[PDB]
Amino acid sequence: GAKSVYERLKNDRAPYETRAQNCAQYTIPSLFPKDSTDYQTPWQAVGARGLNNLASKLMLALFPMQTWMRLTISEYEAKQLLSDPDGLAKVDEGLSMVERIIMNYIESNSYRVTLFEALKQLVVAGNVLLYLPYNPMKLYRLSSYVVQRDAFGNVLQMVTRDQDVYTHIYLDEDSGEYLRYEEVEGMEVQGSDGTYPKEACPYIPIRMVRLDGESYGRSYIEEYLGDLRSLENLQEAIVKMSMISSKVIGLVNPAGITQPRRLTKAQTGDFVTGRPEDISFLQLEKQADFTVAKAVSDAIEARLSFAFMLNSAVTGERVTAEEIRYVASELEDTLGGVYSILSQELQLPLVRVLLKQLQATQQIPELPKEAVEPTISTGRGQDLDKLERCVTAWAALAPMRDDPDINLAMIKLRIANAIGIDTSGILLTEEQKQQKM
Amino acid sequence: GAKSVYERLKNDRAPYETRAQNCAQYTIPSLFPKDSTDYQTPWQAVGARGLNNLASKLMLALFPMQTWMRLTISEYEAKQLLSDPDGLAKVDEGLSMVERIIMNYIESNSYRVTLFEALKQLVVAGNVLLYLPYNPMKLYRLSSYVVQRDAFGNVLQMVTRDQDVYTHIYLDEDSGEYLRYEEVEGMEVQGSDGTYPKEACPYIPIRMVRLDGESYGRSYIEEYLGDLRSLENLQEAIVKMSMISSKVIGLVNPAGITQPRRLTKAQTGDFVTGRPEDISFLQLEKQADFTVAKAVSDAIEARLSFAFMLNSAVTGERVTAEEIRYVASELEDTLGGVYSILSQELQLPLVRVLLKQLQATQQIPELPKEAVEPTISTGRGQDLDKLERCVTAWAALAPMRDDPDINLAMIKLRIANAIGIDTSGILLTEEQKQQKM
């Protein structure tokens, strides 16, 4: 409603962020600043790199910058019945152009690099963006914003912080569209309320892990703190290996003849006048940690990687690309749980909002005919795979075309049922054949 | 009946949850919160990742988001006799459209990511969802709900908790359809009773392990606490490896000449004025744990994985995808015990409930003609495999077509019996042959 204060909202958010400070701490801070400061860093490089690696993967997959978004009609039973007759061609002109415009917009409006700087962070739990009319995006963080619902995941009251500038984006009563004003510490800047029709206009927070739900969601690399094992281990081996073999102080008894200055002067093969070995070193005693530590770190790297999707072409691996391709595909889905969640905070929202802000009538041109609800491609995946198998078999049945005992057409249809591509373009009817012959 | 209190129901549920706190504890909490607070975590990353990996697998398999659900007629002996005559084509139009609508509904209504956040948890013992009319789902947890039967697994009295909001979903007497009201702590909110025709409308709890049965079921990763071996082992090796090789305190006797500040100052090759080695380190004595621990962890990983159906594309394994494909298929069934149980808390219920809530007459359009009971595809599996073998053999018999001693047709029919694909589309009759020749 009307209060308005983000202090109460921040109080509601503390545990989610802190779990985030941590997660930030062992990878590539920053990302998050801990809570004159000379730098501190992440020793455990492998944990940090993976995060950067994912990002490329995430950005590309979420949208390849060629043709990601397909705006669908989608068919109403009279809209599919008119057109017919074959105005569908100009439905394509209206849409492709919108599709032609957005693909020249978003790359042209430089969201992608900005999205990538924010997206990567999202692999740390997540964050709000986007404004409308150079027109860039902005990238509010977990130090900044507070949001709610008691709900299934919707938006009720958004709060923001950058400089001090607070925004209220409240869902209203006796209402519908949102209303959103900005404030200073009392009361209003006169940049007034926009009702904001539902999600459209603007600016949705992306959830990421959805558990259980009623929060600004807590994900993710928090599911992987087997890196804690690597980072601690790497540091344990390094100091212990480093300090003993370098810091070799020379103890002398200052009782006489052995004088430190003369000792440095003689060359390796030199003789030096000294008491009988009075001065001696304090090189440390036997230190272990070798075998267990090394294997585990290597073992941890292998376990860690399949999380951060790396092609991981070790053997290395030779034979080779198909094997590499198979490795990528089985591994890729592992993230396929995420894709659905990512898509929900991203494709629908991203295309949905700009399209809604492209209702401005500036060359969007149609005031959208509901519904042109559009969704986002991406994996099908299996359809290429299911289809491929018939060729491997069908190829098998080429030799037996001549034999008269069994009907080949019936047999393919049997294999056809095994790979769920059934009919409609895969079976050839009798009427068609003479035309050729 | 009418009481109404979830406190009594929660009391009935304690052991099932706690076994769940635990199971949560060694994998990726959270999931479950244990029972300010900073963070504690799962060291044993491999146990945690597997759970995430399964999820992708589970979601995809349970429903690929292409064409999972096949609504069947199913044939009544006059409905199969009328149609004929060949109105079956418009039975397909009525159904496909329902099928065309649900496939555009569920992906379009964003259940899938929400289902995935809940589904994964289900690989921890399980949980309730779904509401009717943005229209998302909600994802009640083991901290929330209580349910019963003395029975074979049905539903008698459901209780819920989110904020305080309690729901009663009681099976009634002198009855039939369910009735469901919501309450505050006395007595009713006037969102009144819906009879709810049996399962339809709404909102079935998913069981998962069915043992013995009469409960909110207790599964699963509780069948695998050979991870306890890995997690404990990983932590035992890590602290022991870490603490000794890093924390090297320098003991000095404060009796004189050896002064701590001077000691740090000299460079590795420096000489330092000191008593004859008075100060000395307390680097710990020989510590074992190397050989036994490492192999077992590696051994445990191998044993653990075939549980969480990782592709396990190790050698690596170059030969290869057919080999990779065979590995996936034999391994996949291992979970095939689960699929039946998963399907029962999922495909029937999920399609059954929305179809029942699509009886609203909003474009579902038919008030369903009983029975259109629909079921869910998914493995058959063997039928592709059984069928494939005839081609490998039949191919073998191509060479002997010319020889006159033995009848080839009779021989194929013999092999045909070996691979249970018998007849009906695999044998060619005499009448057919001339047409071609």
Numbering used by the authors:
A (entry chain c), B (entry chain b): 12 to 46, 51 to 148, 155 to 184, 212 to 362, 365 to 428, 434 to 492
From the paper:
Escherichia coli bacteriophage T7, a member of Podoviridae, has been used as a model for understanding the DNA packaging mechanism common to tailed phages and related dsDNA viruses. The phages package genomic dsDNA into a round procapsid using the portal in complex with an ATP-dependent terminase complex as the motor. At the beginning of phage infection, the tail is responsible for receptor recognition, and the portal and tail act as a tunnel for DNA delivery into the host cytoplasm. Here, we determined structures of the DNA packaging intermediate and mature capsids of T7 using cryo-electron microscopy (cryo-EM) and symmetry-mismatch reconstruction.
The DNA-free T7 capsid II particles, which were considered to be a DNA packaging intermediate subsequent to the T7 procapsid and morphogenetic precursor of the mature phage, were purified from cells for cryo-EM structural analysis. The local refinement and reconstruction improved the structural resolution of the portal to 4.9 Å. The lower resolution of the portal structure in the capsid II suggests that the portal might be flexible to some extent or deviate from 12-fold symmetry during the DNA packaging. The portal in the capsid II is formed by 12 copies of symmetrically arranged protein gp8 with similar topology but different conformation compared with the portal in the mature phage (discussed below). The absence of the barrel in our capsid II portal structure and in the phage procapsid portal structures suggests that the barrel is not involved in the DNA packaging. The portal clip region interacts with the rim of the open icosahedral vertex and five protrusions around the inner capsid surface. A structural comparison between the portal in the capsid II and that in the mature phage revealed that the portal undergoes considerable conformational changes from the packaging intermediate to the mature state. The whole portal moves downward, resulting in the exposure of the clip. This movement causes a squeeze between the inner capsid shell and the wing. Therefore, the wing undergoes a rigid-body rotation by approximately 25°.
